[PDB]
Ligand binder design. Structure first.
Ligand SMILES: [Mg+2]
Ligand SMILES: [Mg+2]
Ligand SMILES: [Mg+2]
Ligand SMILES: [Mg+2]
Ligand SMILES: [Mg+2]
Ligand SMILES: [Mg+2]
Ligand SMILES: [Mg+2]
Ligand SMILES: [Mg+2]
Ligand SMILES: [Mg+2]
Ligand SMILES: [Mg+2]
Ligand SMILES: [Mg+2]
Lengths: 100, 95, 52, 315
RNA sequence: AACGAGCUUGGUGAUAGCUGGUUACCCAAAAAAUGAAUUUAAGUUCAAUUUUAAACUUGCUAAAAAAACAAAAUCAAAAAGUAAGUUUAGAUUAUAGCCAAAAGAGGGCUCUUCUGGAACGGAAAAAACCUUUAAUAGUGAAUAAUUAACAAC
RNA sequence: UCGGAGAAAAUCUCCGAAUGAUUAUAACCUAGACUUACAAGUCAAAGUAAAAAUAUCUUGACCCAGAUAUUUUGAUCAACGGACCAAGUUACCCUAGGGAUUCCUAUUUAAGAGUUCAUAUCGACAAUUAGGGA
């Protein structure tokens, strides 16, 4: 219950944090965003939350998605909503340990 | 609770707390999770892991347990080789 | 309908874990991780615990 | 219904990829994160097509292509354009010349001699150990006669003290034509000295087109120079001084890790203790400690402790 | 001389989530009837609110673009008007409202959410409508709202 | 008691669960979070270990009793936060309290009745900000 957006766009998120909960795929995992068993979306890197539309391409193996995707109007393609976390720090830095 | 006993005139400990919770000298209380030994066959592996852990108590729960036990249970105990020796004090606590 | 069984490791350890089987299906046996041995070993059904 | 259907995953995939690159009103991931020559070419193609043996090998899937000839052809025909990218990719342009881009033209060649006829070609992005580069390499770029030139070696990333700097391993000046022994040795050759645990330092070999003989007295260095501090250098200032008579025409860069020879360089001639660097990550994030960590496991208290040993205070 | 089970004394100051009562002054602040569990809905415990002291730093309004559904509740950089806010320690009471106005949902009423009110003045009398920052002495003054209104070829 | 669908979140409109079969057998440990009065309930990087990644699809506390040799199992406790185990009846009653004690009719309209003729006496459809009666 209480499915919704736990973190809104622009917020400084720390790793592991949960961004949104959903019974069905209202949003899809984006960049540096993980997917949970229950389909909740959590931050894989500390950063800033960003929502953006993007084209949807499914795994070749799944029959339902390849069939639906294939049977689309040549002109255009369907889209989806994605959630991304923008990493805000470098992985690490080099420091002087000792002079020998 | 017994506030003034007929024989000694003191408060009395509630021995249901003494048999369920551990008090760290800093003021914290540890407990188990209800149901951690029940129907383990139908519980998920993640659920069972959460149940096995030793957990802290809230401020109001700790305030209640402090009322239900006497001072003897709040003293500093110097047990040799104690496995909670390091958890009786707080470090780097600004609050 | 189904029953709760106790699969016991055949690696010589006493490690056991409970599983479910269908009263109709034959006695069960599975490969499962034994922490004491730190290897996969056969677990074969020895006893029933309850009927669930 | 009027429009046809893709009927193939590949056709949809390619269409989708192109659309993402195109700009859109709505936010997207990318925002946040002559004639005679042609006739000659066609004639060769017809000759190759006419050859039955070539067709026979192709239909037998036994034919092969000579990489050696293609490599030479690639360098002459279109190699510089690719060479520009690998310079852009590594950021050479955005570092040496503050974002100015110069297309390389001369197919410059460098190789380090190892004992005997085993030359290690220094291409773009190659990996060369400091040990191999102990001595200066052979440079050949077919300058042709009456062709003044100048050669420069630079480490880009270094200068332990100064972040925005770049040492000059050696600068030959007034190089007349292909021959390089005639260059004025403004700076002797220093062996590579990438500090231990500092990652991959990228070294580049850049050549400028020398219009008129200019004395680089302000750039000459006391030979031998083992006072590393003096090797401080920044191309932009140097190029700006001589930009009138200096225009770059060649590139060649390798990246090298630390090696035992580096210890020799720091001690024997640099005459100082070698610095050691280690990759250090920031400490993990913990929410502010609470007096009552409600519902948190016993591990909570360990997260905020400094010393792993017991203390006894007044006791 | 009050028998569905006598009367007297003691147990006994029986117990009563129920009814009633609970004695000088002054200053100050101040909720609720939201939520949750309860043989629990005439009670109580917790959350939430309020409050007192302490520590130190951002808070209130407003808040673009842009986002989550869409032509305003979340969220919300800079500002600007302003003085509050978070944490620590202690603590009860409260958990049944009332009427007006606005939008819905059931089906006039009855639930739910949003706003306001509790005159000593005006509307006749008038807790709930309108005017009204606290409370003082004066045989001063300017004002607010203010049950009144002026058949038709 | 809990879950699914509508009203659309307050009471109303509907379906199901006290599991089921499948199975690759799904480990230990540990940052950060969701949810929440408490209690219970969710998701999960990194590390290690097994293997050669994967469990897929659609729920009841404490106490107290057990079972094996640490490992585990006990509820239509369904009044579903659950008293270890108790029903009727009272008009013979008691105490502490809270309460209460369609069809007319008057207007407007006027097809049709009244031999002829709307309104002598009446009268369809309707109109009144109109008056009463499991
Ligand atoms: Mg009494
Ligand atoms: Mg009561
Ligand atoms: Mg309210
Ligand atoms: Mg509940
Ligand atoms: Mg009960
Ligand atoms: Mg601001
Ligand atoms: Mg809790
Ligand atoms: Mg992992
Ligand atoms: Mg009950
Ligand atoms: Mg109940
Ligand atoms: Mg009778």
């Amino acid at each position: 219950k209480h499915y919704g957006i736990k973190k809104m766009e622009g917020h400084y998120v720390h790793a592991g944090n949960i961004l949104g909960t959903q019974r069905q795929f209202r949003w899809h995992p984006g960049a540096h965003v993980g997917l949970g068993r229950n389909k909740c979306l959590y931050a894989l890197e500390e950063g800033i939350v960003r929502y953006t539309k993007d084209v949807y391409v499914p795994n070749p193996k799944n029959t339902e998605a390849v069939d639906l995707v294939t049977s689309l109007p040549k002109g255009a393609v369907l889209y989806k909503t994605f959630v991304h976390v923008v990493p805000a720090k470098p992985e690490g830095t080099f420091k002087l340990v000792d002079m020998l | 609770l017994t506030y003034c006993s007929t024989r000694k005139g003191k408060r009395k400990t509630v021995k249901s707390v003494v048999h369920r919770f551990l008090r760290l000298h800093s003021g914290l209380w540890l407990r188990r999770k209800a149901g951690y030994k029940k129907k383990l066959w139908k519980k998920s592996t993640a659920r069972k892991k959460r149940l096995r852990e030793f957990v802290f108590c809230s401020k109001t729960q700790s305030k209640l347990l402090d009322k239900m036990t006497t001072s003897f249970w709040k003293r500093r105990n110097w047990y040799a080789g104690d496995p909670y020796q390091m958890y009786h004090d707080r470090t780097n606590l600004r609050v | 309908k189904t029953i709760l069984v106790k699969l016991v490791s055949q690696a010589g350890t006493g490690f056991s874990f409970n599983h479910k089987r269908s009263r109709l299906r034959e006695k069960l046996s599975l490969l499962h991780y034994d922490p004491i041995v730190n290897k996969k070993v056969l677990f074969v059904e020895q006893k029933k615990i309850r009927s669930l | 219904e009027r429009l046809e259907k893709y009927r193939s995953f590949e056709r949809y995939r390619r269409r989708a990829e192109q659309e993402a690159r195109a700009p859109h009103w709505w936010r997207t991931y990318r925002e946040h994160f002559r004639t005679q020559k042609l006739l000659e070419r066609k004639h060769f193609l017809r000759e190759l097509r006419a050859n039955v043996e070539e067709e026979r090998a192709a239909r037998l899937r036994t034919a092969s292509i000579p990489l050696e000839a293609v490599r030479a052809e690639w360098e002459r025909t279109c190699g510089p354009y690719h060479k520009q990218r690998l310079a852009e990719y590594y950021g050479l342009y955005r570092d040496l010349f503050h974002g100015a881009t110069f297309v390389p033209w001369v197919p410059l060649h460098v190789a380090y001699a190892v004992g005997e006829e085993d030359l290690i070609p220094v291409y773009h992005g190659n990996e060369v150990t400091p040990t191999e580069a102990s001595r200066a390499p052979e440079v050949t770029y077919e300058a042709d006669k009456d062709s003044l030139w100048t050669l420069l070696f630079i480490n880009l990333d270094g200068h332990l003290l100064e972040p925005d700097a770049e040492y000059v391993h050696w600068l030959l000046t007034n190089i007349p034509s292909n021959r390089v022994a005639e260059g004025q040795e403004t700076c002797p050759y220093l062996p590579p000295f990438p500090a231990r645990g500092s990652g991959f330092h990228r070294f580049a070999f850049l050549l400028f087109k020398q219009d008129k003989p200019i004395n680089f007295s302000e750039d000459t260095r006391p030979s031998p120079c083992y006072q590393l501090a003096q090797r401080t250098f920044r191309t932009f200032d140097f190029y700006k001084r001589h930009q009138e008579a200096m225009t770059p025409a060649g590139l060649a860069f390798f990246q090298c890790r630390w090696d035992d020879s580096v210890t020799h360089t720091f001690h024997q001639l640099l005459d100082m203790r070698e610095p050691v660097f280690e990759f250090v990550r920031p400490p993990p994030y913990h929410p502010k400690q609470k007096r009552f960590p409600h519902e948190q496991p016993l591990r909570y208290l360990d997260r905020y402790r400094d010393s792993h040993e017991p203390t006894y205070g007044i006791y």
